[PDB]
Amino acid sequence: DPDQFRAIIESPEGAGHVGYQYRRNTGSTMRMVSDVLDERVSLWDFHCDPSGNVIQPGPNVDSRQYLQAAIDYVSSNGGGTITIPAGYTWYLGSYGVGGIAGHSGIIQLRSNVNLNIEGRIHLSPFFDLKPFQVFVGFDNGDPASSGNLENCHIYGHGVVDFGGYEFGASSQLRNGVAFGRSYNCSVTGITFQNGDVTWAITLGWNGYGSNCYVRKCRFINLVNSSVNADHSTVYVNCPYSGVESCYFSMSSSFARNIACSVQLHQHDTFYRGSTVNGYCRGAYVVMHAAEAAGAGSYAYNMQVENNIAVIYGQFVILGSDVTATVSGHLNDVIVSGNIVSIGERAAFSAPFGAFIDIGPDVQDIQRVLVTGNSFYAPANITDSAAITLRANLNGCTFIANNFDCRYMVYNAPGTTSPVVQNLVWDKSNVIGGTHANQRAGQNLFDMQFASVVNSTIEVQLSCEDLSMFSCILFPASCQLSYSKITVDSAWTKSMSNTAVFEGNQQAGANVYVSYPATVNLTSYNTQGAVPFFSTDTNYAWVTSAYSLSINENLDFSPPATYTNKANGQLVGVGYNEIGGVRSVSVRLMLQRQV
Amino acid sequence: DPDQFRAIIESPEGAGHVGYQYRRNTGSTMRMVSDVLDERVSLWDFHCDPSGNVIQPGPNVDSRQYLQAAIDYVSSNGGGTITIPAGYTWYLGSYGVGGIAGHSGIIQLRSNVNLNIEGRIHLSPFFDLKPFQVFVGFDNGDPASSGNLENCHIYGHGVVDFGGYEFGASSQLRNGVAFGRSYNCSVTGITFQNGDVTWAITLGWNGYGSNCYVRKCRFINLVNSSVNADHSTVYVNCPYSGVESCYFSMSSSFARNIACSVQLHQHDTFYRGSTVNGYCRGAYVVMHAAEAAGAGSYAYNMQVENNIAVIYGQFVILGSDVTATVSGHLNDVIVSGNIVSIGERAAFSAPFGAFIDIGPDVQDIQRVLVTGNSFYAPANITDSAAITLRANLNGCTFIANNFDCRYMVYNAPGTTSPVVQNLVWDKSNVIGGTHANQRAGQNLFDMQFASVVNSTIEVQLSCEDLSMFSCILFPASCQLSYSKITVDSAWTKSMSNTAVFEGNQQAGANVYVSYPATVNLTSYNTQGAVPFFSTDTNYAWVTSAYSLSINENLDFSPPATYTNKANGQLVGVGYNEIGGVRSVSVRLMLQRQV
Amino acid sequence: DPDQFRAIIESPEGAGHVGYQYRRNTGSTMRMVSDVLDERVSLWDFHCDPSGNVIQPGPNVDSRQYLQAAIDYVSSNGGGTITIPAGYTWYLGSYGVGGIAGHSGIIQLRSNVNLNIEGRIHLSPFFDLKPFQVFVGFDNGDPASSGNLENCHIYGHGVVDFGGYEFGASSQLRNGVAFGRSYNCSVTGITFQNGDVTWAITLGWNGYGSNCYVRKCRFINLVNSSVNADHSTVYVNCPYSGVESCYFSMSSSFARNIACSVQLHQHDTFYRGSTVNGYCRGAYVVMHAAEAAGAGSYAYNMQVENNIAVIYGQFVILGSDVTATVSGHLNDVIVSGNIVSIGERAAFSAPFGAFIDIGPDVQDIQRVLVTGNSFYAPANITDSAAITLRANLNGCTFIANNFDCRYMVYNAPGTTSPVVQNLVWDKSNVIGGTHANQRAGQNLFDMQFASVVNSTIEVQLSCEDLSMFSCILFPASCQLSYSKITVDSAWTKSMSNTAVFEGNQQAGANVYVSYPATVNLTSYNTQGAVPFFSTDTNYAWVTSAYSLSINENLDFSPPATYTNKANGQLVGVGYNEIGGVRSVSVRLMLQRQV
Numbered sequence A, B, C: 001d002p003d004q005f006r007a008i009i010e011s012p013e014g015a016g017h018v019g020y021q022y023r024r025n026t027g028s029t030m031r032m033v034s035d036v037l038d039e040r041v042s043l044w045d046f047h048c049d050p051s052g053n054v055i056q057p058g059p060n061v062d063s064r065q066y067l068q069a070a071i072d073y074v075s076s077n078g079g080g081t082i083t084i085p086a087g088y089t090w091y092l093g094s095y096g097v098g099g100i101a102g103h104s105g106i107i108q109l110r111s112n113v114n115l116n117i118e119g120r121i122h123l124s125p126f127f128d129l130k131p132f133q134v135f136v137g138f139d140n141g142d143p144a145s146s147g148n149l150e151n152c153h154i155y156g157h158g159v160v161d162f163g164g165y166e167f168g169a170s171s172q173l174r175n176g177v178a179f180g181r182s183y184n185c186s187v188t189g190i191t192f193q194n195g196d197v198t199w200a201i202t203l204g205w206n207g208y209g210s211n212c213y214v215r216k217c218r219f220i221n222l223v224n225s226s227v228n229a230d231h232s233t234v235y236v237n238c239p240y241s242g243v244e245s246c247y248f249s250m251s252s253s254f255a256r257n258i259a260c261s262v263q264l265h266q267h268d269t270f271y272r273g274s275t276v277n278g279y280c281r282g283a284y285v286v287m288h289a290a291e292a293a294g295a296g297s298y299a300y301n302m303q304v305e306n307n308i309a310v311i312y313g314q315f316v317i318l319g320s321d322v323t324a325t326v327s328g329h330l331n332d333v334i335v336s337g338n339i340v341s342i343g344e345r346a347a348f349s350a351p352f353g354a355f356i357d358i359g360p361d362v363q364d365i366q367r368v369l370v371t372g373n374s375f376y377a378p379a380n381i382t383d384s385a386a387i388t389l390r391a392n393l394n395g396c397t398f399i400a401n402n403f404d405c406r407y408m409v410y411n412a413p414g415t416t417s418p419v420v421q422n423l424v425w426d427k428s429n430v431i432g433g434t435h436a437n438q439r440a441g442q443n444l445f446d447m448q449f450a451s452v453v454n455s456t457i458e459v460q461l462s463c464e465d466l467s468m469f470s471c472i473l474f475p476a477s478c479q480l481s482y483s484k485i486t487v488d489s490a491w492t493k494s495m496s497n498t499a500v501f502e503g504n505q506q507a508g509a510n511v512y513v514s515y516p517a518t519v520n521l522t523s524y525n526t527q528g529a530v531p532f533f534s535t536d537t538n539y540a541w542v543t544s545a546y547s548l549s550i551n552e553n554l555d556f557s558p559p560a561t562y563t564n565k566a567n568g569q570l571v572g573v574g575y576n577e578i579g580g581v582r583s584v585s586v587r588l589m590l591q592r593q594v
């Protein structure tokens, strides 16, 4: 049948008739060529017209149904990896159908079906002014009724290009990859670019999912208009999941005001080793009660480490909230090894610059460690703080950071009156000098709170700034109890005010406080050991004080150390070599219970 | 010969007769189809019966000999990568033969032969109740006589499933990958699951090997029975080797009592960026003298950083030991950036909770830096410590950590009496408040040692805990010399005991100590400058003291500062505006040589 | 035409006549075998003689033109990935031509053309004694006229072997991969070995380039002769670029004196997670004004974290410089989590050992944070320092490090006289004890500078070292102002000198200083409250002092605290129970404005 043989060979079954054995090894399987070819699969195997003839991709070709067919087919065989070939741009030109339609989905991902994107995937103008989620892992329009997406990995050296199209309306949503209720899924190596989107990738769905990761990806120019309501490049909404070694860049002015790189919203999540430029915000670390279904109502074991950022707003934002029925809690957080600066901008030209923000809208944030970070803002940016503490806080600890910005602790007066507990600012935090001389009328630690309890503020300057009103100021409206507040004397000799308690709160029974002050004293006339007393009676709270001044006199000396008396004078015993009433003005370290 | 031509084409040599040139490029090599196919290799090329017909894998098919044949064949050509295809589960049903038999080996790995596991590898019930090591890189039953395994990489999106089978006896061993005397080997991307094993991966053999790594792997439910004697998921037994970005999870109760994620046992080894849940222990960092053959008897440059863990026992365990002939030493260790909690459990229901443990069974551990970590244990877990110091220590330094647990330093009285040198607890360690009010009868730093030398403990509270017996207590049995022990006054005003030296050890010539105390004093009756003396004679050791109390009196003041006298009284000079014997009880900061 | 059919099949077009459809799927594209084969490409498709017959690689075969042809061809189709097959060594035996010739180039890389190196690439002896750059991404002999290289990735399990050939002359250059003006390029997984080269990889060109990375690579024995002038394994000369998780090893003696692992020379660059053995230096972090064209004249956001190193010289070297026209600035640097030791060597046998060096040859270095690192040098290495501060510094901050070496701060007297600003050494830096008893004639902090301003040095010992001359010494030639210098008393009771100011600089108006001293005092004879005065008149600068000694006497007590008098005596009020002139020698804490 040698006519039939030639016909068979040229037919689509022809490769199934040509035998093969690996490297002529007689111990190897006797196969057909088609068997070996069938070990791999690409978009070319599905990118064909109804008569089976291949179609070249391009801007007038909608590749969506072909990729979907490929995905569908490989899913039917228990999975595999589909290559999107290099050297070609594959345009997407229509919405998907079925369970992804509720999500404005283009492509449905399926379990165990990996995409090796080596070429480029580009959105056609069909999508201009419309919502879209390019890859969707949900299988139901209602995520609560969705099955899971498992073991789906997107990787390669290729690109997803969003076509530069602006949002049509603020209320729209746009996404690159929504993995859905996603278990062991990942994106590695891909560049996402040239868009106006809400997110590039989302992981999980309200706590459902596990072991999802974004690694070695680039995210470039993904906000481009004033219509875009909000952008967060990666939203991590399942536990045991994270972002590592990624690069995030924006150029748009709008991004400086609206864009965040990462959301960590479930327990055991991380954001590491990544570089951010041009964004408003670095990361939110948040437990929303509305997202607590899959993994509980606590966000714990949250890690933000070893990132590099230039931002215009706030680096890390901490928060939690409630619904009628569920209480969200954020605890057990570490922020460490990050090097962050506020980019060159005018004061008040973007959201208030901060390393840590305690974001408003019942919060419960505690057990946070912020350690071994650097923060810098240029000297003109009045709105820059180590922490903007703008809502209730139940604990945050700062150790061994270097903060070089306008404020250390700040909240705006007569906005919120946060209730503050367990704010620990260790003496090993180094306060930079870039804003020296810029602080007229300002308090370095401006404690504009309802109350402060169980808190520690150990102020240590590293250079002079005599422009500042005070190192630390508590308004009379702020209650202060069971706290330690100290101001180290270095670089403070010429300051009129070091610590200010406008409500005399430092007299509290369990307030432990020390700071420098200038005190005028007068002695009795007695020759010999002689008392010196303060002229003012403002010191009923002082347990001891000691001299920070030299004694220019030969004929007498004031006391080295002082106690107080019931009338609020200080008193100490000096020495009159010759008698006479003495009158001196001395710099003292005032101490209370320390 | 056109009959012969058709026959040739359908034969196993047929692809070797069909010509090919890349993309019709006339400058390309004129090849045959078989040449291009021979560029890749899969298990399908060896998974055949004796007549060459392919065999489908499945639970009634033992794939072992076929994979071994593939490995053997590729090794003969100088190496390559064998694909274990996606969409299939490949069952292993028998032991291997030869040099791996001594190791209970299933598959022998060979140098330069990589395995790309995209499908699933599952153990058949043949292995129920038996020992096994799935992949073995030794080529001799005696590892000391083994050749090396070099340049062998196992990677992909696939899975090794251990079939859920329990151990048959405690004395058995079970492993996933033993690389052997392994140089430039790695496992990346693989999920190891559903087992009862000793290890999932071991790297090296008693110091022999180099540049072995486990990256982006998952390890899930690898302990399931009470028979399992001990589990450590990755054992690193060669230098210049490590674990990074991995995920470790257990669900079994037995795992909470026996399972550790990593062993770092040779120099220049690391454990980074990984997430652990459900394990007893995080990592051992140990030099066993018995393992010192390949790389010397020092474990140095050991790094445990930026991990996330929920454990039930101890995070990092430090140790070393000796044989008759060889002395093991552990030095130059860093533990940093880790965020760790003891999981919800009853007190004493698992091994004692600790961030650092100094593990018993001559140790030599020194030059350890523990910095910028968080640790948390729930308030009910009495058995929780920043360090359980249960064997000899030659040095460990703690700086800028946040420890929130029951004890800071602990050892059980009348177990061991460790000899302690160079324990440094810097003031920048922040002590959390979760266990406040839980510490009746307990010492926060319970120094239950034979001796303490060249040590620093700078206690700083961040909130009150008046339940505790003391901040720090030394029993009379503990010698204390050439040390600094300080208790900051903040939050201590109402404590009866701050530091306790049951053997009066704070009087030592080179002991530098300060802590608060209440002292009753009486003055002479003299008007004017007047001495006040303590009623008790317990202060022969005090170099100075100063007031931590206000003076409620108008008519006199006690001294601000005090020295001592030979009889052990304190003495200072106050001021009697009017004469009369005065009697006061004051809170003082007692100081010795500081 | 069945003769023609058989002929066609055996021809190079034969595979283009054999039909295929994926897995017999009738919905799949009807293709030819050649179409599926054309989805991949290897060196075999170009490694052929002029008649198209394949050539086997080997030491007598020059593979260069064949690889270049492959690269060229794939570039023409918009890119792809070329495999360099496993199981073969591919020798390079000649220079390339054209635009790479100016760079001594062998292979020209092209945009979007990736190289998957699974086999070995070896240099033939043609290259002995000659310069070479194996892979070059420039397209012009003058880099300023070069186009860019974009989207080029080199990866796999293979090896580049430099053939062991020595340099022929010091003035020559040799490189593995020069990416050129390189945007989104990377090298992953490759081992570079057995050479005498200047660099293994360079990224960027004078600030031009972006998003270039070296990951999971090994670099082994890349210096082997005394001819080699200088070696730096990776030179990062574009922003948003870095090195992570790499391994660097040298065995040569010459490497201990000349070799550095990484250069970070542009903003937003990083060096993380890597292990170094046998090198002189870890990393330079430098802004050269001569390299400022592409990305500006500031190196900012520079990160060196979580590395492991054994080196013989300096870990991190900081610098900047100028040209006639351009000023380079280095700022916003973090160095954190690194564990580093000086390898076993004789004192002065290699460049001076240091954790941080401020390298000479107008510098501008500021806003540097050095935190949470360990450093160790063996006790014999006299030339070991936490910082060698050998050129001008505008700021560096040290917090919570553990430095165990001979010096903390050092500069050699009568070499440079650096101008120092904003040097911050926080009290949380722990000073190790390995060099105790080795410091005869040495100052632990040897402040051999022109001047020191706005600086903080808080010395805290952790053990005794009475061998040292002083803890800190300022020569009379060093101006000191607006600074804080403190020496904690612990472990200092027996020291003759703690802080030394050879120019009496501690008297400065804005110098804040405290340290211990022994002081002889004499009292008046008066019974009762009685003054004690120092016999020496060296204390005009002291604001207060207090006792660090016990009082062995019953009949009197010296003052607990002292002030001074205009003549430079100290004075305080003690108590004579019985009268008589008293004479005591006491250890005091001397304080000035603190």
Ligand SMILES: CC(=O)N[C@@H]1[C@@H](O[C@H]2O[C@H](CO)[C@H](O[C@H]3O[C@H](CO[C@@H]4O[C@@H](C)[C@H](O)[C@@H](O)[C@H]4O)[C@@H](O)[C@H](O)[C@H]3O)[C@H](O[C@@H]3O[C@H](CO)[C@@H](O)[C@H](O)[C@H]3NC(C)=O)[C@H]2O)[C@H](O)[C@@H](CO[C@H]2O[C@H](CO)[C@@H](O)[C@H](O)[C@H]2O)O[C@@H]1O
Residues within 6 Å of the ligand: A102, A103, A104, A143, A173, A178, A198, A199, A202, A204, A205, A206, A230, A231, A232, A235, A237, A260, A263, A284, A286, A287, A288, A290, A291, A317, A318, A319, A320, A321, A358, A359, A360, A361
């Ligand atoms: C851009 C971004 O992520 N911003 C963060 C805030 O997130 C919140 O606003 C977003 C605005 O885009 C999201 O809401 C929008 O999308 C919702 C979800 O889309 C639906 O469900 C999807 C699964 C389908 O595919 C879609 O087709 C659609 O059906 C939609 O319901 C909203 O109407 C719309 O506005 C974001 O919603 C979350 O999206 C993730 C990712 O897709 C998804 O997994 C979640 O299910 C979904 N959550 C919920 C509850 O629906 C929404 O959360 C974020 O709130 C803010 C955190 O900071 C604030 O709150 C802190 C705690 O009080 C406080 O401290 C802080 O100061 C506050 O600013 O951070 C970013 O702004």
Ligand SMILES: CC(=O)N[C@@H]1[C@@H](O[C@H]2O[C@H](CO)[C@H](O[C@H]3O[C@H](CO[C@@H]4O[C@@H](C)[C@H](O)[C@@H](O)[C@H]4O)[C@@H](O)[C@H](O)[C@H]3O)[C@H](O[C@@H]3O[C@H](CO)[C@@H](O)[C@H](O)[C@H]3NC(C)=O)[C@H]2O)[C@H](O)[C@@H](CO[C@H]2O[C@H](CO)[C@@H](O)[C@H](O)[C@H]2O)O[C@@H]1O
Residues within 6 Å of the ligand: B102, B103, B104, B143, B173, B178, B198, B199, B202, B204, B205, B206, B230, B231, B232, B235, B237, B260, B263, B284, B286, B287, B288, B290, B291, B317, B318, B319, B320, B321, B358, B359, B360, B361
């Ligand atoms: C599970 C685990 O790793 N536990 C750690 C302890 O390791 C020790 O016990 C293990 C129990 O499973 C291992 O011993 C077992 O296996 C030995 C080796 O198997 C043989 O050799 C292999 C190469 C072959 O393939 C096998 O067929 C067989 O011939 C076997 O000899 C023992 O009888 C058996 O109990 C573990 O042994 C090491 O295994 C690694 C990995 O396979 C291998 O590379 C080494 O060669 C082998 N070492 C030796 C010396 O044989 C064995 O080390 C670990 O000791 C402990 C550390 O903490 C303790 O010690 C500290 C220092 O004193 C102390 O501070 C601390 O408090 C102590 O708890 O940590 C885990 O428990």
Ligand SMILES: CC(=O)N[C@@H]1[C@@H](O[C@H]2O[C@H](CO)[C@H](O[C@H]3O[C@H](CO[C@@H]4O[C@@H](C)[C@H](O)[C@@H](O)[C@H]4O)[C@@H](O)[C@H](O)[C@H]3O)[C@H](O[C@@H]3O[C@H](CO)[C@@H](O)[C@H](O)[C@H]3NC(C)=O)[C@H]2O)[C@H](O)[C@@H](CO[C@H]2O[C@H](CO)[C@@H](O)[C@H](O)[C@H]2O)O[C@@H]1O
Residues within 6 Å of the ligand: C102, C103, C104, C143, C173, C178, C198, C199, C202, C204, C205, C206, C230, C231, C232, C235, C237, C260, C263, C284, C286, C287, C288, C290, C291, C317, C318, C319, C320, C321, C358, C359, C360, C361
């Ligand atoms: C080995 C190394 O990298 N050493 C570091 C120092 O770099 C400087 O010396 C190098 C010696 O090899 C390089 O100069 C050499 O190469 C130059 C460039 O080659 C040319 O241009 C290439 C693009 C072509 O392919 C070549 O064919 C050739 O045309 C050449 O011009 C020089 O003559 C030659 O000596 C190195 O030069 C840089 O090389 C990189 C990587 O290839 C390239 O991207 C740059 O363009 C090129 N730069 C310049 C300006 O040409 C050259 O920089 C390095 O200077 C030192 C830093 O520390 C010192 O300076 C600090 C600041 O003052 C100071 O604090 C510190 O104490 C100092 O030691 O670090 C290493 O030693």
Ligand code: NA
Residues within 6 Å of the ligand: A102, A103, A104, A141
């Ligand atoms: Na929807």
Ligand code: NA
Residues within 6 Å of the ligand: A366, A367, A368, A369, A395, A396, A397, B402
């Ligand atoms: Na905390």
Ligand code: NA
Residues within 6 Å of the ligand: A449, A450, A451, A477, A478, A479
């Ligand atoms: Na209030």
Ligand code: NA
Residues within 6 Å of the ligand: B102, B103, B104, B141
């Ligand atoms: Na054995």
Ligand code: NA
Residues within 6 Å of the ligand: B366, B367, B368, B369, B395, B396, B397, C402
């Ligand atoms: Na240490």
Ligand code: NA
Residues within 6 Å of the ligand: B449, B450, B451, B477, B478, B479
């Ligand atoms: Na004892």
Ligand code: NA
Residues within 6 Å of the ligand: C102, C103, C104, C141
């Ligand atoms: Na050149």
Ligand code: NA
Residues within 6 Å of the ligand: A402, C366, C367, C368, C369, C395, C396, C397
């Ligand atoms: Na700094």
Ligand code: NA
Residues within 6 Å of the ligand: C449, C450, C451, C477, C478, C479
């Ligand atoms: Na000078």
